[PDB]
Amino acid sequence: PRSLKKGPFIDLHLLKKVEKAVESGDKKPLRTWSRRSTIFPNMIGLTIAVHNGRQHVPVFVTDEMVGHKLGEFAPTRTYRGHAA
Template sequence: MAYWFKYGQSDGYSKHFVEAHVVKKRTFRKFTYRGVDLDQLLDMSMDQLLELMGSHNRRRFRRGLKRKHMALLKKLRAAKKNASELEKPAVVKTHLRNMVIVPEMVGSIVGVYNGKVFNTVEIKPEMIGHSLGEFSLCYKPVKHGRPGIGATHSSRFIPLK
């Protein structure tokens, strides 16, 4: 609903109406993992964190992390420690596609091997609970083209180029 006034005229309502819409700011959604925000996740013990995770991840962590997985976490800690405040940490390369992403890894940059190259993955809070391999595809997605000869019975009648 618009009010039109001559130059210099106004009513008190329209002035407050305009001010109310100018003050409004954009709010960003704060990240939570199953209702717990990132700061609290970082402060949690491993047992408390496992209660939030799914059964597959709980079982993997209860059976214990292997030496290679612990070495990866150690390298990620060292890379974060050596980076200055404004810089991103150095890329840590790994073949461990089955490593579950934990809150401690957030902000790190990992080179995940896909069988051919190391794909650089920056770990974000939304990735917690997923494995590293999910973010480095080891196959090229299929782009279906035209059917070739012998693909179907009707393809006999498709003229050759």
């Protein structure tokens, strides 16, 4: 994982959007393509729609999701199974 000396990674655009949403208390889902941004503690309580490659899957952030990347909660490959 990313070195602890570097600090956690978040795309500045998403950080600004999260700050604005928290301050304004808005409840509209925030669409993002930044699957690589970490889930910060401030994010908890917000609905963030992470791009799965073809759509933005809605994700309601909880406390257990802190530290994981947003992409870990938006599967990109769909597999019904062979001989379904």
